[PDB]
Motif scaffolding. Structure first.
Motif, mmCIF file in Angstrom:
data_model
loop_
_atom_site.group_PDB
_atom_site.id
_atom_site.type_symbol
_atom_site.label_atom_id
_atom_site.label_comp_id
_atom_site.label_asym_id
_atom_site.label_seq_id
_atom_site.Cartn_x
_atom_site.Cartn_y
_atom_site.Cartn_z
ATOM 1 N N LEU A 165 31.399 0.576 8.985
ATOM 2 C CA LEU A 165 30.747 -0.594 9.544
ATOM 3 C C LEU A 165 31.485 -1.895 9.297
ATOM 4 O O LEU A 165 31.469 -2.776 10.162
ATOM 5 C CB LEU A 165 29.326 -0.703 9.006
ATOM 6 N N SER A 166 32.153 -2.011 8.145
ATOM 7 C CA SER A 166 32.653 -3.307 7.652
ATOM 8 C C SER A 166 34.158 -3.404 7.349
ATOM 9 O O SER A 166 34.670 -4.512 7.085
ATOM 10 C CB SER A 166 31.880 -3.724 6.402
ATOM 11 N N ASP A 205 36.092 -5.426 2.782
ATOM 12 C CA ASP A 205 34.688 -5.605 2.430
ATOM 13 C C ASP A 205 34.117 -4.442 1.586
ATOM 14 O O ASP A 205 33.344 -4.670 0.652
ATOM 15 C CB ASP A 205 33.852 -5.835 3.684
ATOM 16 N N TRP A 233 34.801 -4.381 -2.412
ATOM 17 C CA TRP A 233 33.853 -5.101 -3.256
ATOM 18 C C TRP A 233 32.729 -4.125 -3.686
ATOM 19 O O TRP A 233 32.341 -4.102 -4.866
ATOM 20 C CB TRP A 233 33.296 -6.361 -2.534
ATOM 21 N N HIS A 234 32.207 -3.374 -2.720
ATOM 22 C CA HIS A 234 31.130 -2.416 -2.958
ATOM 23 C C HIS A 234 31.604 -1.228 -3.822
ATOM 24 O O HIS A 234 30.842 -0.727 -4.657
ATOM 25 C CB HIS A 234 30.572 -1.933 -1.598
ATOM 26 N N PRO A 263 26.400 -5.644 6.766
ATOM 27 C CA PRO A 263 26.812 -4.711 5.693
ATOM 28 C C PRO A 263 25.996 -4.804 4.398
ATOM 29 O O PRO A 263 26.118 -3.933 3.577
ATOM 30 C CB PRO A 263 28.245 -5.175 5.370
ATOM 31 N N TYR A 264 25.246 -5.890 4.168
ATOM 32 C CA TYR A 264 24.500 -6.063 2.908
ATOM 33 C C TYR A 264 23.001 -5.922 3.094
ATOM 34 O O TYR A 264 22.243 -6.259 2.214
ATOM 35 C CB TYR A 264 24.791 -7.430 2.270
ATOM 36 N N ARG A 277 23.479 -6.157 17.128
ATOM 37 C CA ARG A 277 24.823 -6.264 17.686
ATOM 38 C C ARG A 277 24.799 -6.602 19.176
ATOM 39 O O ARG A 277 25.536 -7.498 19.628
ATOM 40 C CB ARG A 277 25.668 -5.006 17.386
#
Lengths: 93, 93, 93, 93
Positions: C48-49, C53, C56-57, B29-30, B43
């Protein structure tokens, strides 16, 4: 490409015992030329027959698909079998 | 940029065991420098081979795309791996 | 304005678990300070996350754009999270 | 196909002693025409009755499934029983 791959496959067959340290299950993650079907079949072969017997089938299957020697060299390096990788590169040239 | 990235990638490889706490699925995710294709491949690698083996491929893939070190530092911080993030920033400088 | 926004963002980060009831997809309609780009990215992050999560973004992105705290207070009220809205207003003052 | 397979099966039966070097457990990895059920039954037969007696059942089972002669020729070659493989190819023609 055909001449070079055939020559490399012939060399692997004649020098099979050089390659018996190769672990089929460990090497599969580096062989994207193998289809999902190929991987499942090879896993089953390994389950039924053991790694040594499966290596023959691994090499036999690799040589049918396209772009196998480059990935095989990569896969050998990925498994830290550098001398083996170099020996393959040498024959494939 | 190339010299600095190559140096950082070389450092990650030599010090791989420092980075084995990194969880590939948590870090993705980052990492917006990775393409959708990269993420799907990683994956699958993780599914077939486990996290440790996938980390090698993660680092190998990161180093090909552009602007990877900054995001990798960010991603390490995002996963609360601050010492690791700082260790990367230090080598990249 | 900067001091007050920075203080509010710092408070949201230190008290993140207070805000984990916030549903990113539900709150987006009340956040016109986010660009269309921001909204699409956050949707993808959520896909995706997961929501936690992505929060935070969400907060990280909000704090970059202009006029975010007022709209965030509004958005919390729009989602019937009045105590949370009041807690933000209180820190922003 | 039927005429040729029947003829080959008849030949294997009349010349059974030619084939008594065949090791059932070693040959199974090269016989994908046998079902998982067939393989388990043959293993059990081998456990209870020994290899020689199981060979009869191997041949009897092979001839029921489809595409058995090609794989049997392959399996004989896989076990380095080339003369036997050639003798089968010769009758199957």
């Amino acid at each position: 490409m055909a001449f070079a791959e055939d020559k490399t496959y012939k060399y692997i067959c004649r020098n099979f015992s050089n390659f018996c340290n190769v672990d089929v299950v460990e090497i599969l993650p580096y062989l994207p030329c193998l289809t999902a079907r190929d991987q499942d079949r090879l896993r089953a072969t390994c389950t039924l027959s053991g790694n040594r017997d499966t290596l023959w089938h691994l090499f036999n299957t690799l040589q049918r698909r396209p772009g196998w020697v480059e990935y095989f060299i990569a896969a050998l390096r990925g498994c830290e079998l550098v001398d083996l990788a170099d020996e393959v590169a040498s024959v494939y040239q």
